[PDB]
């Protein structure tokens, strides 16, 4: 979900990075990430943009 | 039978029928002989395109063989009383109250297909009764008559004893042949 | 709707699900304990009211 | 055919006829001949709008080439029964019976359009039958006919006798000339 | 046509017909001749009312040039059969029985405009065959006669022997006479 | 030009036709002449209602000024066949054909208004034709005559023999006068 | 006008018409002159009913003076050829394609109603033109009598030479009678 | 008057009329007299289901008296035009017209109930007014029967000369009579 | 009666008519007699879908049989006036106004049917009254006969002096013949 929000935000993915990487910044900086299952956050392009859809 | 098309928008689709589609885009029809149930009609459409947009034109297709001439005075009134400019189309027929129709649209705004044809003729009548009533009805069509010319006048720019010899009786006139005499504008052959 | 049922895809089939801060004894929030739900059985039961005309 | 029209709101998109679209804005259109179902379908448009907003004033349209005398009076006891004030305006034709319910409209709130014609004479009648039954339409209509020009006088100012002469055969008059006659308060030209 | 109106509520907006939205309001509109088609079906909207209010005053719109007579007496028995009162204006014209079903409506609730006309005579019918036939139908027509009077004396008030001098050809009558007469109990001339 | 109505409920607003919301009551109208299609639409007014619930009783009101026989005799094997009991209502007029419907109807079930009236007669027919096909014609519709009256003599309770006097021709008869006759068992004048 | 009603499901409530609703049941409607317009239509309803369900009865109520035989054949053929077995109920009236149409039905499901009334007669034509086509139509008519015979005499179960006798003038047959030709197996008095 | 059916669908249903209930399932009905206006409104079918499925069969039930020739060549073009095979049912009557588009069908694929009746003859007009107007109608129309009979060769197999002498005059012929001639290549009796 | 069908779209199901549904697919109808009512329908449906997608050609079919020229014109102004590409179909017939309309297609995309008929004649008409009108009207409908000839030699490119001749007495031309002509580019008869 977007910052500033009940949701999860973007900046997570990075802390399992991390501990995945024994906090080794520099290993993280150079990893692979695997965002799955981003079919679902397509925008309803058929309905007016009338409200900010995070998710 | 009339056709329903559908228009997308962004709450979503909706259907509507060809002639009310037509209406949406500021585009009135004016089909048949001229009569006061068609008159109010077409009016109350007008009136309609002013509380929306008062500043855009106002398309008004004239394919009509001629009507009553009262049922016809009233839209004209209407025409100069709005302030949007109300666009006018010679498309195919214009008689008496169809070319009185023709020439009252916007200045600059009028159009007349190569194809058309126009036709202007002096109001009919006619009465039964006795000669007192007869005579009313002669001195009230008289004006008519006179009331009518001088609104072509203006808006052909012909002067008043032109009218007269031209409309005594019936005169067909082409759609290059209107320009000449003021009652239409331009000619529209293409998009450009 | 389906909002819900994008949501459960990675839970039936395996993911470290992001528990939330604290439900227990645990005072910190932060926290967000990581727990793998590859090994968690999850039956789901409903009514599916019209599905027998479907199947018709 | 009747078009159909969309008013945007923020309750959700709703369709309207052209002339049920104009009634939600006070205006009630009068067109053909005056008859019982036309007459009792547009005292009911006048109910429905008092009770909306009985203090904004209510258009009334008037094209009509004339019709029933009984039916007209049922309009007219209508118009100065309730509370608002009705505009009346003179759009195409007036007959006897349609220019009665043109000044019958509220003081100083009656207009008739440049182009538009009036006419006015007694009613009309007749009766087949014995002698006796002869006369008691005779007398009733003759009750009608004084009945009319009381009250045709007395909205638009004249004497009962100016009124009854000019009244005796069918009378044309100019929407300038309604003016001084008294039918009309003023004339609409150009939306100022 | 008729337009289309619509009634803010509770659940929502909801459209209904300009008929239909007075009926909502417990009135009914009686146009045109008197037939068993619109008689029946006035009777179906007066027994629908009763249901959803058995206590509250029902309004009655009689605008007809008259019709059968056998229609007439099924709604008469109808507003003296159901419980709540039934209120009768008279605006335009009302014949022999829309003048009968005037009067039945509830004392005290009778109202009548100041221009509105009531007609009032004896029934009409006719037979053509056999002679035998004929006096039967004779007698018929004779018994209506006789109870129509009978009812119409006991909700003007008049003697049985007045009813019928007065109704042996056409009588007609206008608001305050209504009243000297007994048809009516009182006139609407402004609000309040 | 039918009102409509609507029924409000817990579920939520349903428009409903003023005739059609009589149906759900077990309410059925019989407006104007007697034909195939107004018949056979009865008749299936009549199963509906047996489908829904066939223990719970059926109102017909009756107003017609009479029609073909075979149409209405169609009606009545459908109303003693069905087990639900038929309520049968005279409404204004009642000929032959409405009078044969009127004494079907349920015992004890039978109503009628003061002010109504009911005639009956023989069945009426024709043939133009060779002689021996007008033998045929002639003696089917004596048949018919016959079969007709035993019908309404076992329903009224008379005997088969004072009724051919009585339908030998056409015979009026008024709402207290029919109970004597036994086509009816009681009349409805005010509620309780 | 047709009545609508409303039909309660799980998914919601939809509202049907009266012969719609009807038609779920299995239950068919002939009535008025037989044609190939409405012809037509009783056909599809047929084969509609053959794919919901091709084991279950079917109803037809058939109240029909006749029509045109070609129109006849185009349901006969349908109700032969389908699987499921269709029910003929003879109501009011079944004339020479009527009656036709009763006998079309399943063995031992040929009701008819006690007051019913069933003719059969030869059938009907002719030609206007040179003798040459005169003398093709008569020999194609005649055809269609043992044609017609032939089937009739089929499912009823009676010799042709008897048939043709029958057939030869009009003869009217009622629902007794009627079981000794064998056109019906049983006479529905009363359900159950 | 036009029964709805509905069509149970997985995600819930939908009401169609009985007639586009079975345009879905590749069925159009001809009925009545052969006209531009029906014309072109099967013609639409046909177009609109190869689009759907450019493979499946299609059923063409005729039932009709013959028509116009111009019009009834704007179906045949279609059928013989289009990519699937169009399956010919003749319903109890069939003209020249008729007859004509039931052999246009497919090969394999044409039916007809054995109650049937097919008529074939030659195309028959008129002209009024001069002699040499009068000439070239009667040219034309001799090419219009020539190419017809050519046409009907080529799909029923026989001769073109027989196929003149045959249709010379009218010709009337049942479904084993068709079978023989190439018109119908099957014939429908009962299910499997 | 109108089928109804449903087009399956990505955002759902909708419910269009069958003439309607073709209209997406820029394909027009002209059925039956021309006049001003059907000529502005079709006008409409042209610039409607120019507003939709003018890069798309557009099919028109013809299978009227005559009728007014004034009407006619204001369609071909139409076509040749928009930017798209119009392709004329003849179906069934194509009468004087009905070939205009064929011939003044897009080059290269006119098609005909084999079975398609043509006619061609000079344009009709009449007057009565004084002479002197009468020679004013006489002058205009030979220049609409030269106007039309001119533009037909337009785009089947034959010689003025060619069409003059032929165009004198009604000509029938069948499909063959008229791609010799100029009329029609090519035959239609199996697709692909």
């Known amino acids: 979900t977007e910052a500033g929000y009940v949701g999860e935000d973007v900046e997570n993915i990075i802390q399992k990075l991390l501990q995945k990487s024994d906090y080794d910044v520099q290993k993280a900086q150079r990893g692979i990430v695997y965002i799955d299952e981003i079919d679902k956050i397509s925008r309803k392009s058929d309905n007016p943009s009338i409200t900010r859809d995070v998710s | ?192 | 709707g389906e909002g819900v049922q994008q949501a459960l895809l990675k839970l039936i089939e395996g993911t470290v699900a992001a528990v939330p801060p604290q439900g227990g004894r645990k005072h910190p929030q932060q926290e967000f304990l990581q727990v793998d739900t590859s090994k968690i059985l999850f039956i789901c039961g409903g009514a599916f009211a019209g599905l027998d005309k479907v199947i018709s």
């Open chain 2, 1 to 192: 039978l009339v056709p329903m098309v559908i228009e997308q928008t962004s709450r979503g689709e909706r259907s509507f029928d060809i002639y009310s589609r037509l209406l949406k885009e500021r585009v009135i029809f004016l089909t048949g002989q001229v009569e006061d149930h068609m008159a109010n009609l077409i009016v109350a459409q007008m009136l309609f395109l002013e509380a929306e947009n008062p500043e855009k034109d106002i398309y008004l297709y004239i394919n009509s063989p001629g009507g009553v001439i009262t049922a016809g005075m009233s839209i004209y009134d209407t025409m100069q009383f709005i302030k949007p400019d109300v666009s006018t189309i010679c498309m195919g027929q214009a008689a008496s109250m169809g070319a009185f129709l023709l020439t009252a649209g916007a200045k600059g705004k009028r159009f007349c297909l190569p194809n058309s044809r126009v036709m202007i003729h002096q109001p009919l009548g006619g009465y039964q009764g006795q000669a007192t009533d007869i005579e009313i009805h002669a001195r009230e069509i008289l004006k008519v008559k006179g009331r009518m010319n001088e609104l072509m006048a203006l808006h052909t720019g012909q002067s008043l004893e032109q009218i007269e010899r031209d409309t005594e009786r019936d005169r067909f006139l082409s759609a290059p042949e209107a320009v000449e005499y003021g009652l239409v504008d331009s000619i529209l052959t293409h998009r450009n």
